[PDB]
Amino acid sequence: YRPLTLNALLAAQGVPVKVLDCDTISQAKEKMLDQLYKGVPLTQRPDPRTLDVEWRSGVAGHLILSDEDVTSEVQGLWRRLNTLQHYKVPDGATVALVPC
Amino acid sequence: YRPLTLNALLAVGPAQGVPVKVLDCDTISQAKEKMLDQLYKGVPLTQRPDPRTLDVEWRSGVAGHLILSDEDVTSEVQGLWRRLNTLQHYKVPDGATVALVPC
Numbered sequence A: 001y002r003p004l005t006l007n008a009l010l011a012a013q014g015v016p017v018k019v020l021d022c023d024t025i026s027q028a029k030e031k032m033l034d035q036l037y038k039g040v041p042l043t044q045r046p047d048p049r050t051l052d053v054e055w056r057s058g059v060a061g062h063l064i065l066s067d068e069d070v071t072s073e074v075q076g077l078w079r080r081l082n083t084l085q086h087y088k089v090p091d092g093a094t095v096a097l098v099p100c
Numbered sequence B: 001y002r003p004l005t006l007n008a009l010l011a012v013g014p015a016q017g018v019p020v021k022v023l024d025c026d027t028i029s030q031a032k033e034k035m036l037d038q039l040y041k042g043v044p045l046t047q048r049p050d051p052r053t054l055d056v057e058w059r060s061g062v063a064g065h066l067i068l069s070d071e072d073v074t075s076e077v078q079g080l081w082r083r084l085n086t087l088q089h090y091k092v093p094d095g096a097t098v099a100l101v102p103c
Helices: A025-036 B028-039
Strands: A003-010 A015-020 A051-056 A062-065 A078-080 A094-099 B003-010 B018-023 B054-060 B064-068 B081-083 B097-102
Touching: A003 A025, A015 A025, A025 A051, A025 A094, B003 B028, B018 B028, B028 B054, B028 B097
Parallel strands: A003 A094, B003 B097
Antiparallel strands: A003 A015, A051 A062, A051 A094, A078 B081, B003 B018, B054 B064, B054 B097
């Protein structure tokens, strides 16, 4: 259970967000929302489902992260929920919440 | 990987069951497809119900009349891993009566 800190954006300026590398994308997204909306009135906060999680990697472009996609580990009838470690998200990664 | 034969019925309309060979490792979706193809043998595609409009009902005197699905509250979990439900998951026995119910 390695902790990480994300540089979270709502898409200009990044905010630190404490997460674990074994958090699912859903779990990490909650934690990001908690920091990013802290100063936003209740009535102005979007529904989380209208946002996607976008990892803007340093050197290799942007990627939408989700709990289930073409990358998910499958073994016969079994499937693993995608985590931050699954995607190889490093400590200090810039991650944006973007219109879905 | 045990073969099973189900006693398959339609739940609407007026011993009535027809035999359907399945595998116990078939998903509910897969079992449903095999049940429709036997029950509706001879009936053109255009005269068959959309499969998504039917639920699979296992009429057990022991477990109850259960609606079976590929994914539900009973699905096996292990950490972050979830398994699709099969006939073996529900422990549907050989010769089980299973109905297709308008859904």
